[PDB]
Amino acid sequence: DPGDQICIGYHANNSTEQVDTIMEKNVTVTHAQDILEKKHNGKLCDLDGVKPLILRDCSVAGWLLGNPMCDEFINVPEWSYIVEKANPVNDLCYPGDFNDYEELKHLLSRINHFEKIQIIPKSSWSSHEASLGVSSACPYQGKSSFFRNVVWLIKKNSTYPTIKRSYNNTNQEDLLVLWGIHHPNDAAEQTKLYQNPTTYISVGTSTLNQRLVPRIATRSKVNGQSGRMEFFWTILKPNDAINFESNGNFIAPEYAYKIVKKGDSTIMKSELEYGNCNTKCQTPMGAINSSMPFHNIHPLTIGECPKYVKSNRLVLATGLRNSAIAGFIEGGWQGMVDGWYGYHHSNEQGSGYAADKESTQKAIDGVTNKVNSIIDKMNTQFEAVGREFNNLERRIENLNKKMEDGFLDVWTYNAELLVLMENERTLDFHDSNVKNLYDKVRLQLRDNAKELGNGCFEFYHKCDNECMESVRNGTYDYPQYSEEARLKREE
Amino acid sequence: DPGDQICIGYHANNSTEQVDTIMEKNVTVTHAQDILEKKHNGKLCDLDGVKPLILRDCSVAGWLLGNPMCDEFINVPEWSYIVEKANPVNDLCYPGDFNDYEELKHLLSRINHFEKIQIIPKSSWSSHEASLGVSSACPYQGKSSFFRNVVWLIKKNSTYPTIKRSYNNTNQEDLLVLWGIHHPNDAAEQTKLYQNPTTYISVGTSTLNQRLVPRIATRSKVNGQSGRMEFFWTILKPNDAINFESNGNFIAPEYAYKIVKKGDSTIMKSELEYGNCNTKCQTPMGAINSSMPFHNIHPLTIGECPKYVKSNRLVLATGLRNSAIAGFIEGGWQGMVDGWYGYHHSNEQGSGYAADKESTQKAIDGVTNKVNSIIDKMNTQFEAVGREFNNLERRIENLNKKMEDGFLDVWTYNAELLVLMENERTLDFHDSNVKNLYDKVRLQLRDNAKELGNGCFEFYHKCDNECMESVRNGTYDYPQYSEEARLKREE
Amino acid sequence: DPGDQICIGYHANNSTEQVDTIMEKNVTVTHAQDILEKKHNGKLCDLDGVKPLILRDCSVAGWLLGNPMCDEFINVPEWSYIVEKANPVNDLCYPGDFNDYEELKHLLSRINHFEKIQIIPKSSWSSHEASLGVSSACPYQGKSSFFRNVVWLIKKNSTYPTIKRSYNNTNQEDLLVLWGIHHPNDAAEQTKLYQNPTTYISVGTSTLNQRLVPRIATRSKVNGQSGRMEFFWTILKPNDAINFESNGNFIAPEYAYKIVKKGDSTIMKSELEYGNCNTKCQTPMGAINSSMPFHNIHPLTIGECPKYVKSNRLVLATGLRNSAIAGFIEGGWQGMVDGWYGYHHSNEQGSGYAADKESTQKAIDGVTNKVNSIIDKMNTQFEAVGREFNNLERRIENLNKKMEDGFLDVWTYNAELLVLMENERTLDFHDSNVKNLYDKVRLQLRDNAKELGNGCFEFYHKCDNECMESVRNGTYDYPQYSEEARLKREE
Numbered sequence A, B, C: 001d002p003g004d005q006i007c008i009g010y011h012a013n014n015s016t017e018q019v020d021t022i023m024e025k026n027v028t029v030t031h032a033q034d035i036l037e038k039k040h041n042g043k044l045c046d047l048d049g050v051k052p053l054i055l056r057d058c059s060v061a062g063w064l065l066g067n068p069m070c071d072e073f074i075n076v077p078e079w080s081y082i083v084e085k086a087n088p089v090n091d092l093c094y095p096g097d098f099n100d101y102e103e104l105k106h107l108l109s110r111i112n113h114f115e116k117i118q119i120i121p122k123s124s125w126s127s128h129e130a131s132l133g134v135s136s137a138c139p140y141q142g143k144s145s146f147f148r149n150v151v152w153l154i155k156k157n158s159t160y161p162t163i164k165r166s167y168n169n170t171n172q173e174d175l176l177v178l179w180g181i182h183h184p185n186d187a188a189e190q191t192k193l194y195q196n197p198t199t200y201i202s203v204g205t206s207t208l209n210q211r212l213v214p215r216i217a218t219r220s221k222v223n224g225q226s227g228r229m230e231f232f233w234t235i236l237k238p239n240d241a242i243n244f245e246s247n248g249n250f251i252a253p254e255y256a257y258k259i260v261k262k263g264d265s266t267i268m269k270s271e272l273e274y275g276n277c278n279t280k281c282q283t284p285m286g287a288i289n290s291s292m293p294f295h296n297i298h299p300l301t302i303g304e305c306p307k308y309v310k311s312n313r314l315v316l317a318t319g320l321r322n323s324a325i326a327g328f329i330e331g332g333w334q335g336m337v338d339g340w341y342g343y344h345h346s347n348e349q350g351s352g353y354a355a356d357k358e359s360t361q362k363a364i365d366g367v368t369n370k371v372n373s374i375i376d377k378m379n380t381q382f383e384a385v386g387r388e389f390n391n392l393e394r395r396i397e398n399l400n401k402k403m404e405d406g407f408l409d410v411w412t413y414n415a416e417l418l419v420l421m422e423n424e425r426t427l428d429f430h431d432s433n434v435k436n437l438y439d440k441v442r443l444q445l446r447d448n449a450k451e452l453g454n455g456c457f458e459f460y461h462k463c464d465n466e467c468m469e470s471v472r473n474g475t476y477d478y479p480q481y482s483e484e485a486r487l488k489r490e491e
């Protein structure tokens, strides 16, 4: 009056953390983990400890040629990725085109070493006019000027003698060389400037075999010239030579560029500050330190990154559903300060809670392992997501978009369902575990005690603290009390 | 002789609906849902309430230029996608080429507004022959004729004077302009037609800088001309001007086209009728109203669509395995007219079936939630799947094919396995639920009744209808009958 | 002293095979299956019973034109895929270019029929020099020579008369035709060789309309010529004709090629021997006979193949966790020589183990079905993974790489997690099965026997071998022993 007791129960707490399973929405849970990265540092940072290349209002074109209003960061021998604005103000001062422009950007996205040199001195032009080739389309100190890396040759007295110049790459490294042809308005401008009326430029390497001829049209004024400049480029292998020849209309090299190229990258489209940080994932809205296997920031990322997923929350249940002294069948015990599953005894030496170290370790190690698998099994490659196509490559641009949207639709769907199914699995694990511990006890006692129905057993004998620890240890000796039990039963 | 009874059991029905799980094939089930869309309305319909553009035997080329045998639907100011046949009969009446043809189709796939206008009246040609430029390759009323949107200029008396024409876009909207060059057979035809023996066309905008020169070859007759026409096009920004100049061989604009462009789409390859319907998914074999997250019709779709999957059936088990008065251990009760899990009592006031509202709601809400997750978690973007590459882009066409086949192989595999694993999960849920309800009862009664082994309990006392409702309610008072039970037991 | 007994238990064995589940790492198991193909036969073999095309040191270019040092396998009328080395020694003997080279390789990757013919006899050149067009860049028997499939025409006496040649395809099959233009160094070489100082080649079909003009530059010596040859090609529809015309610099066809084309394939980059085998998956490190739905060899594969996955082991648990005579609660019985789950009785006729045929069949059929689903549900299409882009298509090459790496990242991740989750499912199945068999018995006996707690029941009466077989058969008659039991109990 009354007899000794032991109850099986589980942990609870004041946690309000909610989770979704394939079957139940908004399920309050004990503790849970988010696997979606949502947080960016709002800045552009190094990549594997290498600065970017941030063109403030210039453009790879304007930058290369020397657009005089491109007052930028001149000296910088290497970079990881490149950063243009949306529509950079300063591009081509004198209007025209850049042969294979995009393919060049892509090549310049990631440079190991980059040193500008001088292949044809501006002073070497003894029999042509080097310092007259100047326009009001390219203002400097309020005076007319021109691209500073490349020379507009004019006729001397009234003579454009044929130009023949070879240059030989005697550096250790490939050379990026740049020249151009002036397409003038009419045969007046043509001969006023180059005299000879039928001109041409031939350019030759061991690869190249060029022969450009000025085109005439009536064209609309752009920065007030109806003239057009069209530039070209080659890479000069490290012991080859380039040979120029020109009747006129020649925009000569002054400075070329030594490059060492080690794998690609891409141009990024951002309005952000450098932040002097490092990172391994750069986004056009900030960087990331991704432990997380998913993120939802911006799709146009560079580096080893989490998969981009259209979603706000991916939360994994790690703990339990969250809700005499009645056992598990009437809810969880707040008084289980430590341990996930365990007991509550009450005998003549007194009542306590007592955690199940063994079954609570398997449970934790299991859930820790689940969360870590879902993360460390994620194959993370270096990738650079850019927008590399002009507006006569809209078919190829549209093939790129189906691929990105296609991979988004797959990752966004499989992450959602993986959380929903693997949560339902985690909460049915917690149930299956509590109920297995009841039966661990129930099977040991048998008739030496009675199932009360609330998740406790009342004993048919004296169970002191030392008897309880045999029940929890799973070492309960029944023939040792089978008799004492038998008597208090029959009655 | 005999005692009062209560049995736990489950629903059954005459349903023959079958399902597959990861382990069991052909499993008869109570009721199940198909998640594969297989049904199309065999017609071409609007998209987001916008008509297509159905070219009956013409082609974007033939359509644009005015191939006289292209007796089509002239007036139509906007469209969503475009529809060619396989090999349209009427294309280029006079043989030749269309510069950047594919890139133009892609641009014209989706037009917000499209109004043809007249930039150069056919009557403005005072000093050249506008009405002689006619071929038997382009028959109309059985007479020789030519593309009606573009003019074949010939010499007057025996003089082709130089043409200089500027046109200025003074409309609000971009302009698609079209011209061409006649490549004739020999220097006889050349001068018979344009007189001057060395001709050229220059075309200039703020973008463009063209200079075409007729090519001569000996070429095979095609519609009986060994001549060739080669056409070109530009988009004229809304306050820019285009300037033409020509010694001869010029196919002049008459009519250009105002366009407003708002995102792309694609050309579709169908033999189908317009059906005056709306839709958000169009296929080349009909449209779809996709609640369903998968479909198996045709891969070349346009709109927000289900993922295309190579499969015939994706069926989700929603109900139960389908098979005194014996409880669950001997099968399901047909007599459970309503409810999934429940009881069958039999006492001195009589025998009935009685559904478990509470446990049967959790079950339904759970399964309803599962099916809805598998559907509403599907990220559905607008996409247009076309065939946009010529037969010198077979490498890029082959890159598109690996991507489509690649995404098919992923979706087809993950849908199959998701149904197989999530079915097995649903039927083990139904088992785990029945068996939990047995133990809900079994734990309440204890020795006040006896487990018969068939899934019933026989009572060791009088259980009237009101006692039964405490067992079903889970409010069964045991000390209230513990004594009356104890006596009828001992004996 | 003592009573008759029956125990429920499971199989064990000396197996050390380990497996990972979402929760437990390194779990010793009874037997398990690997689903990753890792084994290749180190050789290049047929595909669907068709030989490849293995160019030992030549290149599609060098091969086609007849580079004299391309001592290869001449006669071969059909092939499946093509095999170059990394940087083939013999390519273009005389330096220059091949118009649309890559697009041609792609076309020649898979040829149904391929017969070389002669369209323009070398002897037909009555008024030009056919046998003087020879260089020291193209040595043969230590003498100067030239591409053997194509003719270098020189002037006769001191006259290059105009060439006009039509050829008409009167074969059943399309024709691949090849010609070229000599770009010489200076106007001296030009007229020394072709006499006329301003030359041209026109080429015309019903498709083509060509007019090439030699270019001059000062170019670097390559195999000691600063000259350059530039070749071109067309496909001649089977009843069309090609017409050549040339003032000079013409490299004439001698031999063209009949082709029948049936779907594409790709060029492969291998250093391997032909092995006279067949296969349906060829890799650049050997072939595969893929039952397996995954492999980890090399990504650049050709045929119907397993998905390429970055992983070393994908192992599926098929058997059980691996560890009176105590029942299941104390471990597995080595003495269960046959059967997965079953019994161990002990009575007055003696003790034995006895397998549960019925429950052990469901288990095997279930696991066999799981492994087969995970394999036979894998959609396997024919695909050819190559490297088809030059180094001015690096943007398109980079779009191909994101797609491959993208599909790798998906398959590698989903296979890892599918094994981890579906293993945990398989071992919880084995538990749920043992424990259901205990309760199958426990429910049949009731008070006619006592739960010992170790997973056995001790009988409260005589159970001979025939009584045991009713318990295993599930046909145990309790009213038949309810009395005999009742007496031996009360006491």
Ligand SMILES: *[C@@H]1O[C@H](CO)[C@@H](O)[C@H](O)[C@H]1NC(C)=O
Pocket: A025, A026
């Ligand atoms: C879930 O919880 C939030 C409250 O934070 C609520 O906005 C939402 O409507 C709830 N219900 C469902 C069905 O998601």
Ligand SMILES: *[C@@H]1O[C@H](CO)[C@@H](O)[C@H](O)[C@H]1NC(C)=O
Pocket: A157, A158
């Ligand atoms: C140009 O050069 C000088 C002027 O300093 C003069 O002697 C020479 O004659 C000039 N040439 C011509 C052809 O006018």
Ligand SMILES: *[C@@H]1O[C@H](CO)[C@@H](O)[C@H](O)[C@H]1NC(C)=O
Pocket: A168, A169, A239, A240, A241, C220, C221
């Ligand atoms: C460039 O100079 C080096 C060193 O004298 C020489 O060997 C090389 O051949 C020159 N370049 C060319 C293309 O001749």
Ligand SMILES: *[C@@H]1O[C@H](CO)[C@@H](O)[C@H](O)[C@H]1NC(C)=O
Pocket: A466, A467, A469, A470, A473, A475
């Ligand atoms: C488990 O509990 C008993 C009693 O408290 C204790 O003596 C011992 O540490 C454990 N039993 C065994 C066999 O180790």
Ligand SMILES: *[C@@H]1O[C@H](CO)[C@@H](O)[C@H](O)[C@H]1NC(C)=O
Pocket: B025, B026
């Ligand atoms: C499943 O059921 C259908 C009968 O509708 C039958 O054709 C098929 O062969 C059955 N068996 C299996 C193993 O799929």
Ligand SMILES: *[C@@H]1O[C@H](CO)[C@@H](O)[C@H](O)[C@H]1NC(C)=O
Pocket: B157, B158
């Ligand atoms: C062409 O124009 C008129 C014919 O009406 C004639 O007066 C004129 O002389 C002609 N020109 C020539 C050069 O024949």
Ligand SMILES: *[C@@H]1O[C@H](CO)[C@@H](O)[C@H](O)[C@H]1NC(C)=O
Pocket: A220, A221, B168, B169, B239, B240, B241
């Ligand atoms: C077209 O006309 C407008 C209005 O007069 C004018 O401002 C514009 O400059 C003209 N176009 C060009 C390219 O000049």
Ligand SMILES: *[C@@H]1O[C@H](CO)[C@@H](O)[C@H](O)[C@H]1NC(C)=O
Pocket: B466, B467, B469, B470, B473, B475
């Ligand atoms: C459940 O059943 C009892 C008896 O039928 C009824 O009085 C009551 O509605 C329920 N019990 C409680 C505590 O509400």
Ligand SMILES: *[C@@H]1O[C@H](CO)[C@@H](O)[C@H](O)[C@H]1NC(C)=O
Pocket: C025, C026
């Ligand atoms: C698993 O087993 C292998 C021994 O074959 C061992 O190398 C590895 O470190 C073990 N442990 C884990 C956690 O993987």
Ligand SMILES: *[C@@H]1O[C@H](CO)[C@@H](O)[C@H](O)[C@H]1NC(C)=O
Pocket: C157, C158
């Ligand atoms: C070239 O051909 C023969 C030489 O056999 C000679 O009769 C003829 O005059 C030569 N022609 C010229 C223009 O030298």
Ligand SMILES: *[C@@H]1O[C@H](CO)[C@@H](O)[C@H](O)[C@H]1NC(C)=O
Pocket: B220, B221, C168, C169, C239, C240, C241
């Ligand atoms: C080639 O010869 C056939 C047979 O005589 C002829 O019909 C065909 O028209 C010729 N080719 C061309 C392009 O005329």
Ligand SMILES: *[C@@H]1O[C@H](CO)[C@@H](O)[C@H](O)[C@H]1NC(C)=O
Pocket: C466, C467, C469, C470, C473, C475
């Ligand atoms: C199962 O076992 C019994 C007793 O061994 C045997 O007679 C019979 O084959 C089975 N029972 C039935 C009803 O078939």
